[PDB]
Write a protein that binds this ligand. Sequence first.
Ligand SMILES: COC1=C(OC)C(=O)C(C/C=C(\C)CC/C=C(/C)CC/C=C(\C)CC/C=C(/C)CC/C=C(\C)CC/C=C(\C)CC/C=C(\C)CC/C=C(/C)CC/C=C(\C)CCC=C(C)C)=C(C)C1=O
Ligand SMILES: CCCCCCCCCCCCCCCCCC(=O)OC[C@H](COP(=O)([O-])OCC[N+](C)(C)C)OC(=O)CCCCCCCCCCCCCCCCC
Ligand SMILES: CCCCCCCCCCCCCCCCCC(=O)OC[C@H](COP(=O)([O-])OCC[N+](C)(C)C)OC(=O)CCCCCCCCCCCCCCCCC
Lengths: 300, 61, 70, 77, 62, 230, 198, 175, 116
Amino acid sequence: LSKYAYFILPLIGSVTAFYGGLVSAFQSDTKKTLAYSTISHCGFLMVSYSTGVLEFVILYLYVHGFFKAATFLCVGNVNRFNRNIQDFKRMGGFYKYLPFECLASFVCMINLSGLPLTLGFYIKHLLFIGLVESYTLYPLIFSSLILGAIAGVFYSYRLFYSIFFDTKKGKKAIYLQASRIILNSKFYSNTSLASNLSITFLVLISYTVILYLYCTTLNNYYSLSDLKSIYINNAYSYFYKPDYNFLNAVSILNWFVIILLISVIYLNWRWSYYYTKSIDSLSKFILFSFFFFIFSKYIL
Amino acid sequence: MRRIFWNFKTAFVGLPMFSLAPKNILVYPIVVGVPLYTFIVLQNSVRGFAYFDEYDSDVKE
Amino acid sequence: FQKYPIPRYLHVGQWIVNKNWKWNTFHMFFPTAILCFMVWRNSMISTAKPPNYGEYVDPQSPVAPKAIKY
Amino acid sequence: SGLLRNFEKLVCQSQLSKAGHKLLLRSPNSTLHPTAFYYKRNSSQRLANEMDVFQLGLAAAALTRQANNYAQLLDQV
Amino acid sequence: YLEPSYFHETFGHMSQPPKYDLIDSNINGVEKKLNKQILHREHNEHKLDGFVSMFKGSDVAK
Amino acid sequence: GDIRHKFSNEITDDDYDYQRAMHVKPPKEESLFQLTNILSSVPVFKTRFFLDFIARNLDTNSAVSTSDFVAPPRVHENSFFVYHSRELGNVIRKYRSLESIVLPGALLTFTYPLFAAFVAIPSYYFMFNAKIYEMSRRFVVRMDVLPHLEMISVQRIGAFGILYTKLHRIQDLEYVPFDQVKEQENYLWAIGGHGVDNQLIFKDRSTGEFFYFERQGVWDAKGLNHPLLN
Amino acid sequence: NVDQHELKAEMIKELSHYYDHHDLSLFGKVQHFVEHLLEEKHHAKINTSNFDQKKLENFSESKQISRTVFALKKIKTFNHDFFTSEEEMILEPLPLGILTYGLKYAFAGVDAALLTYFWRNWNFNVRTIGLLGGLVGIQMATLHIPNLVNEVVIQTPRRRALAKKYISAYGPQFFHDIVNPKYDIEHLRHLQNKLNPY
Amino acid sequence: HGWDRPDVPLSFNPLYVHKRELSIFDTNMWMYDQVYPEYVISYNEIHLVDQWKGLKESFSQSAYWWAMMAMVFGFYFINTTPRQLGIDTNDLKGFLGEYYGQYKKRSGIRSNFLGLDVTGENSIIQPNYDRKNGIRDVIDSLNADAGKRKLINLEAKNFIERVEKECEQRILKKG
Amino acid sequence: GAWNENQQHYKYSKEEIEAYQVPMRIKAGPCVDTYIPLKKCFQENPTSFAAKMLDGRKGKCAKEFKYYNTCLNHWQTYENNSHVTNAYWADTSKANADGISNTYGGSFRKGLAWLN
Ligand SMILES: COC1=C(OC)C(=O)C(C/C=C(\C)CC/C=C(/C)CC/C=C(\C)CC/C=C(/C)CC/C=C(\C)CC/C=C(\C)CC/C=C(\C)CC/C=C(/C)CC/C=C(\C)CCC=C(C)C)=C(C)C1=O
Ligand SMILES: CCCCCCCCCCCCCCCCCC(=O)OC[C@H](COP(=O)([O-])OCC[N+](C)(C)C)OC(=O)CCCCCCCCCCCCCCCCC
Ligand SMILES: CCCCCCCCCCCCCCCCCC(=O)OC[C@H](COP(=O)([O-])OCC[N+](C)(C)C)OC(=O)CCCCCCCCCCCCCCCCC
């Protein structure tokens, strides 16, 4: 029943989401990257509340909390291995020294950044399902929401690749001291077995709880308990029985994400022996995608 | 650790064991099991295997 | 961080390990559990829950909310 | 380089490795002669001011060839 | 596999693998042709009735 | 320095074999289901028909370079070879050939060709113009010198995978320093100038045409050490 | 009033473009136009009086079981409240699983890789085009294969068991009357299933 | 390992020597410490000399993001239709009904239950049942949108009934 | 017959709605009559969230879910005007000519990217 809320929650939420995601896409520190990602997701939570659907707010909160916590633990192990240097400009090649951290960080980042086919993608899609279009500042709000939703790819890819699979930008003492032949044993680990088990169980329980919440809310049979709210809008109609225009708009968003993925994967910012072969791979991937679309839709 | 030493396929515990165990374990079950079981099953059906259909089942609503 | 000596007179918790920590854990957990059990009983005396599934509130029953008779 | 394909017409890299062979490359859109690059009418300034003897000779030869061909065509009009 | 809606939105609807009952083979002759025509008419009428029920049941809930 | 031999329960090198699919290591043994073992054990691959099929398909030996010196066929009777691209030119031509099938295929097979074009326009202008296309336009696929004209024949790649040769006067050629073209084209040199020599950039000043040469391209000493080219 | 079949045919003609037509590409429109000529004619009135029925005594027990399977399929097509969920699943085509879907998309990927290889190397000849055509034809046939195997091996025993359950409860003559084209479909819509607890 | 390291040196906490007068005009402007004293506010972006230069730089560089937001909005504006969003029209006696019911009953300005000759208006926080501002604009917009959606559904029903009647007339007329 | 009606054509009272703990979101819509038997059956058939999330027929709750799904389809279509919107999307010219809904058709713009 507040006009101030109606005006301030979506605008501030969208501005915050855009700002946080954009700054996180440029941060070289891991902890600062995750802090600005948290700022962006808090803005998205504000927007989700402004949509009038509280179930979406609960789902977004749970997904963001679980995967942000797991990513924080992974980057904390990385920082401890790097001896309290949080910037990834002094990292790279940590996949071998931190295998579990690499793989768990991959999973938690693809879930956290809302990459397609993931729970983050589901929560962002739900956010865009219920976004009201009657706001005076809707242009700015929607543009900020789009630019903050596409910003997850950048910071997720940058963090993961720079930490684990970039060149060895770190110091020689970090790598050489952990790679001595005497240390080779069945007990060898640059992290703790307890840390690995904690992160694994955290991810498993997060998946179980998020799936349970999705089944309780997003299923055809709505089984969630009362949220004690009498303001019921029609945002669930577009989740259940959407029209073609909304599907095409979310398709626009998906193709923006795809183009950004193509950019981050294939852009060569530095000279390499594989520069020509990278362009060849891009060309053959484009042709293969076109022919795969042709065959899977028409021929068979 | 447990550096096992085992002549595979030339030893009593191995391929000869695989070839030998089924043919000897399944001797009495196949020489006194089948005849006894057949006698016990077929001694009832001196006149037939038919099930005398009590509770009708020949009636439909 | 490399361990450094700590003054013997200082009652600080830096690198403090008690060799008898198991009995201390026992005698700090179990009585705490008993205290919390007593507090839990006391608070369960004053506890409200909505009706279960298949149960409705009779509006004329004393349990139903009441209005002031001026 | 090819499936269910024969390369009889393909030029061998062994042939290409020898200097002085008699192979000629024919490429699409290959303008190998500048016969029309430096011909322009309604020049603002002198052709000598804007062009040198090489370009002027190219243009003059092209114009002479075209005029002679047209004069040849004049014999059956 | 279970929520391919992203592929439906992003790449459109692809050609599903062929699913058919092949149950009409039980009967043979002109009866099969007549029943197939009846079933095709029923399917078309069912799609039309779904459309008409969607466009008519608007004021049922009051 | 390793002391795993001193202990029994310590991990062995045979346990570190599942990591071979993830860690590069010299081969130790061939597994039962390895591709080499499958090909060398199944007798159907020993038959002549499979051997003949393999020996007459895929890449041909005629296309394999047989020397470290190559003389491409002359573009003109009097011209002499100077410079030729090797693999970047092939990749550029194969990438620009996508416009000959994918672009018409997009028109004839996409439900919304206007949507495809509306997404491709910013992709080109913001990412792909400075990545591949503009470098291809300035890329010198081949360079020969016609001495009678005292000019250079530069063969380049055009939009749909085309090839076209242009003639440029030698006296009109100038050297363009990278620092001279550094700031005005930073994006191109950031994402699309790695395969070409940024320290060897030339320009036909009559038309303002830029000549970029591949770093992996081959130069002929005889053509380069010519009085026309000094 | 008017004939309901003719009225619904006219309404289909009037409203087909509203619900039965989605957006298509140029090649999609070409395929739709081609298939429209090949599509079955939607006839409002179908002459069922030209058919002569054969009594059950001619048919064997297996043929009667097959015909009552078809009768149950007809009822499920007309009356949607007749069968339970499990009976409908027995009577419906079996959904295709990961084997079939991965098979189809592996075929599509192989075709796409081959076509990419042909385009990049310009390997387009009569032999190559024939190979592509044969490959796509074989792939289509062997993608039709899993549905046939599913239907026969799994459903057919289940459908025959369902029919035998229904034969002993309704009547072979009842199902023979149902499969007859002259049977009133309007009466079939309102038929109450004795074998459904509802 | 491999060397007997001495204990952690006292140089790990260097003693700070005050070389400057601690001005009273900088009171609590410094975090005071005997090791590593600091200014109370850290300026990592000191390449901007002032806050006005910082504002100018921020607004100059934020123009790129303004342009990008404009491009995104234009792309979604020439390619997307506004949706049918609003309150659930099957429940109008709820959130919308209660608002207008409260503004209609005016129970906050009734007489005192004891005759104290004071009503709700006699307070700093007092009711105003003739205000016509605030969330009422949004409530009116939601009610109008619900009415519009109901009208669209009614028009669709009328259209389908008209089509059915026209088809019946067409088939019956020809005979 | 009606989509909002359940199998037994029984209307549920306020006390029954309270006792069966109908969520407010369902209560706002018109599908309480079809939702209540489904929830009753699910209470009588306690299944894990995986069973609900995976089963397409909802297992034992088949008929109740069929009625509730029909009601949900109609309810979310009418709350969305998705039938009219899809009719105008399939053929914008024919829908305007027929006047399916002039209120929606007078402010409908498909978009350049979607076949103009
Ligand atoms: C990139 O951000 C920015 C940040 O990061 C969040 C920053 O930290 C900072 C730094 C800020 C400080 C240090 C303190 C300042 C505090 C702030 C809160 C500044 C925040 C600034 C912004 C959020 C940027 C806003 C600036 C612009 C130019 C808006 C960007 C959006 C567009 C350009 C889209 C253009 C919209 C158009 C053309 C609408 C045209 C109208 C129609 C098409 C009609 C449609 C019909 C309807 C019914 C819809 C109604 C629409 C209306 C009425 C339009 C109104 C909307 C508008 C936006 C005008 C700055 C400067 C910044 O810059
Ligand atoms: C009037 C002009 C007509 C021609 C315009 C041509 C513009 C596009 C030129 C580039 C075409 C090549 C890129 C797409 C290749 C096919 C991909 C596919 O399956 O699309 C399905 C769909 C076809 O489905 P559809 O268009 O029938 O409908 C469903 C899709 N929606 C609802 C979103 C419209 O293709 C597209 O949506 C095409 C989008 C192209 C956007 C620009 C791409 C630039 C980057 C090029 C590299 C892309 C790599 C592969 C990415 C996808 C796979 C990971
Ligand atoms: C020039 C080219 C020449 C060659 C062209 C290609 C020729 C064919 C090449 C081989 C492809 C064969 C395709 C047809 C297969 C038909 C299968 C069938 O009948 O399915 C009926 C169906 C397929 O099931 P379904 O997945 O479709 O769904 C069944 C229905 N539901 C979902 C309800 C369960 O059933 C089965 O396949 C039975 C399952 C058990 C099968 C046991 C045998 C071993 C195979 C196990 C599965 C596969 C494991 C390996 C996977 C791959 C690993 C790398």
